[model samples]
Target: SMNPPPPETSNPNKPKRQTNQLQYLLRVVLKTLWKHQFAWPFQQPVDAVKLNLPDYYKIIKTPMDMGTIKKRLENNYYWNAQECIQDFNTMFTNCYIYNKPGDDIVLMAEALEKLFLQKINELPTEE
Candidate 1:
């Protein structure tokens, strides 16, 4: 008698042994950030001089933005949820560091922070 197995893809039954909880948590957080009204400014990295602010690159050492964060998630770059969250902190803080506090960019960052906190808190504590 001879027996053979197909491929790894042959196993159609994928038991819910585990799926990363971090994935879903990050998704909800991203959706909230993506829909923020001030999301436009934080959507991409700022280009110095083009925006007429040569001071940008020289001042902000670790610049980040929503687009980069979302991309990293898709690439599964972060080992844990905290690292992704920390990048967001970097993005928002850079805004306050480089731009006028009363300007639209800074205020939008402020609003985004509020939305992030509000939505993130809804997640189960132990999850």
Candidate 2:
């Protein structure tokens, strides 16, 4: 049965698609996550504040012991170098979505996380 008012034609060669809104909202959501993670500190040039394991780990430590871990990480673990590299690489590539600079910092961070974690699916099976 056809309503035949406009006489539309269907093309068999056309690619099929699913209705997914997540893709549309990805930029927005990632931007939101990024702001929550970085801007909550209420500081200028928020990007200068590093977001790495040691900094995150410090949040849970007792205030008095902060200095001890800082010393340990600085003296032994050399944590900043690793995190700096990770952050730099994440920012350089448009892993999530390619767009112009000065668009959405939060979205960039979100895309970075998704692109970074995608390798988990590529894990090799133990022989």
Candidate 3:
């Protein structure tokens, strides 16, 4: 009981929460991106062989994906939300560069990009 700092006052209704709000919101953004219908294509890395675009690796030297981003976020790789958002932008940029303008995949990327842009815009200013 000595270790318990239980409040005896009536002003202890608030829940205990101890974490960086900015980081928490970053995770929320990642989840939002993942749940997007157009997000499936970006969930994993670009399978150059499966997609029949072997040169994709060469063109998009720095490949980014939601899987990697989520893993990186868990690993605490990003120092701030800016870098996290940057990866999402880069992912869209890579798709736009590789896929034709009118391609279905390109269109999906456009939709996801638009959603991502709007979400980030709504996020609270970086801590």
The lowest-lDDT stretch of 10 consecutive residues in candidate 2 is 1-10
25-119 per-residue lDDT for model 3 (tens digits): 45667877788888889888777777777677767767788877776666565556666677888888988888888999999988877777776
User: RMSD, each candidate, Å?
Assistant: 13.1, 22.7, 14.0
Q: Which lDDT tens digits does candidate 1 get at residues 1-127?
A: 1112211221234322222545754578887788877898887677564577766766877878877787666656565666667888898888888888699877889999998878667755544
Native-structure RMSD, model 3: 14.0
lDDT (0 to 1) per candidate = 0.69, 0.31, 0.70
Q: Which model is ahead, 1 or 2, in terms of TM-score?
A: 1
lDDT of 2 by residue, 1-127 (tens): 1111211123345333322222212234223333444433221212213533233222322121112222322233222333322332333342223334555654545554454345323323322
Q: For this target, which candidate reaches the highest TM-score against the unseen true structure?
A: 1
Error of 3 at 92 (Å): 0.4
TM-score of each: 0.77, 0.21, 0.77
Superior by TM-score: candidate 1 or candidate 3: 1
Question: After best superposition, candidate 1 residue 102: deviation in angstroms?
Answer: 1.2
